[PDB]
Amino acid sequence: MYAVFQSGGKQHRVSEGQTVRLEKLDIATGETVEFAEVLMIANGEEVKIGVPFVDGGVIKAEVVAHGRGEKVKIVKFRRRKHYRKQQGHRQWFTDVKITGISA
Amino acid sequence: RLNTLSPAEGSKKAGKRLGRGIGSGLGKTGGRGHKGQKSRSGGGVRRGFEGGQMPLYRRLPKFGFTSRKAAI
């Protein structure tokens, strides 16, 4: 009982009632979001996508958090050429919990 | 209010400091390049030097004279 859907350019396989982290979305932390772009739905019986994105499959998900990822330190260094550079990055992420998976 | 006065924008530049790190830009000789006479401490050529060629103020002939009546 799991489904495959495309959210932020990268596909996720999520089972019922589990939390999945995906790219930042323009949704407030206390609102449900829709994912009608369901790549595949799996159950005891198997249903595939003759046309991409099934026919009526949707996924109900609730936003939980809108935090930032772990800091990543970017170092660029040229050997013997008197060039050093430092940078930091924290990627924005959105935690969402899957509430319901349709057929 | 003595701790609220500020100068006009662009009045100060903070100057250039040489040889203080890589990220500061002009470090490691502070913008005077690699070896050479100009890179040395106190190096350089005097005014009018052309590297040995006859200077312009020597190739040309002196002309005229100064009139004392012009100053009065």
PDB file of C-alpha atoms in Angstrom, chain A residues 24-64:
ATOM      1  CA  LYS A  24      10.226  24.054  -0.279  1.00  0.00           C
ATOM      2  CA  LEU A  25       6.619  24.743  -1.275  1.00  0.00           C
ATOM      3  CA  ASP A  26       4.565  27.950  -1.246  1.00  0.00           C
ATOM      4  CA  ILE A  27       2.199  26.486   1.355  1.00  0.00           C
ATOM      5  CA  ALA A  28       1.699  27.537   4.962  1.00  0.00           C
ATOM      6  CA  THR A  29       2.650  25.077   7.687  1.00  0.00           C
ATOM      7  CA  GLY A  30      -0.955  24.270   8.605  1.00  0.00           C
ATOM      8  CA  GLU A  31      -2.653  23.536   5.281  1.00  0.00           C
ATOM      9  CA  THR A  32      -3.243  20.373   3.267  1.00  0.00           C
ATOM     10  CA  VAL A  33      -1.586  20.041  -0.143  1.00  0.00           C
ATOM     11  CA  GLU A  34      -2.587  17.995  -3.189  1.00  0.00           C
ATOM     12  CA  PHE A  35      -0.405  15.751  -5.369  1.00  0.00           C
ATOM     13  CA  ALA A  36      -2.442  14.655  -8.390  1.00  0.00           C
ATOM     14  CA  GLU A  37       0.717  13.719 -10.342  1.00  0.00           C
ATOM     15  CA  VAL A  38       0.779  10.156  -9.037  1.00  0.00           C
ATOM     16  CA  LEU A  39       3.279   8.051 -10.977  1.00  0.00           C
ATOM     17  CA  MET A  40       2.257   4.670  -9.565  1.00  0.00           C
ATOM     18  CA  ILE A  41      -0.035   3.181  -6.921  1.00  0.00           C
ATOM     19  CA  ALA A  42       0.763  -0.213  -5.395  1.00  0.00           C
ATOM     20  CA  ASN A  43      -1.459  -2.470  -3.294  1.00  0.00           C
ATOM     21  CA  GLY A  44      -2.241  -6.165  -3.084  1.00  0.00           C
ATOM     22  CA  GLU A  45      -3.281  -5.670  -6.705  1.00  0.00           C
ATOM     23  CA  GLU A  46      -1.001  -3.712  -9.031  1.00  0.00           C
ATOM     24  CA  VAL A  47      -2.064  -0.719 -11.140  1.00  0.00           C
ATOM     25  CA  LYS A  48       0.322   0.966 -13.588  1.00  0.00           C
ATOM     26  CA  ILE A  49       0.188   4.109 -15.717  1.00  0.00           C
ATOM     27  CA  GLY A  50      -0.781   3.444 -19.315  1.00  0.00           C
ATOM     28  CA  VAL A  51      -0.686   7.229 -19.604  1.00  0.00           C
ATOM     29  CA  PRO A  52       1.662   9.022 -17.170  1.00  0.00           C
ATOM     30  CA  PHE A  53       0.026  10.213 -13.944  1.00  0.00           C
ATOM     31  CA  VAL A  54      -2.611   7.443 -13.725  1.00  0.00           C
ATOM     32  CA  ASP A  55      -6.182   8.663 -14.321  1.00  0.00           C
ATOM     33  CA  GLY A  56      -7.640   9.946 -11.044  1.00  0.00           C
ATOM     34  CA  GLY A  57      -5.057   9.116  -8.396  1.00  0.00           C
ATOM     35  CA  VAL A  58      -4.397  11.832  -5.813  1.00  0.00           C
ATOM     36  CA  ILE A  59      -2.421  12.018  -2.571  1.00  0.00           C
ATOM     37  CA  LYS A  60      -3.499  14.024   0.481  1.00  0.00           C
ATOM     38  CA  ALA A  61      -0.639  15.471   2.526  1.00  0.00           C
ATOM     39  CA  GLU A  62      -0.347  17.924   5.417  1.00  0.00           C
ATOM     40  CA  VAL A  63       2.546  20.347   5.858  1.00  0.00           C
ATOM     41  CA  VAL A  64       4.399  19.988   9.159  1.00  0.00           C
TER      42      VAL A  64
END
